[PDB]
């Protein structure tokens, strides 16, 4: 439905708490495939399986290979703004 902008807060050493799939080499968006219980995405809320990640902290993810999205997501620090839309 609507595009949402959601903030995730975590410690440097924590993971985001999401699994992603898709990517340019598969012809599909970066899609959230799992939200892991008790981890930052689950605690903060607003991110769900089936969301496409359009951008993370202002960085466009719409034409990234899978591993490029993994890299950009893995480089996040403590505050992370997600731009997502359920597809």
């Amino acid at each position: 439905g609507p595009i949402r902008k959601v903030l995730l807060l975590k410690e440097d050493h924590e993971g985001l708490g999401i699994s992603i799939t898709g990517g340019k080499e598969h012809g599909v968006p970066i899609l959230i495939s799992e939200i892991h219980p008790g981890q930052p995405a689950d605690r903060c809320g607003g991110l769900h399986v089936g969301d496409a990640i359009l951008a993370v902290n202002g960085v466009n993810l719409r034409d990234t290979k899978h591993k490029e999205a993994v890299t950009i997501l893995s480089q996040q620090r403590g505050e992370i703004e997600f731009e997502v839309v359920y597809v």
Partner: peptide, 9 residues
């Protein structure tokens, strides 16, 4: 193959 990568971050 056709299978998609899945990665936890």
């Amino acid at each position: 193959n056709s299978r998609w990568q899945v990665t936890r971050v």
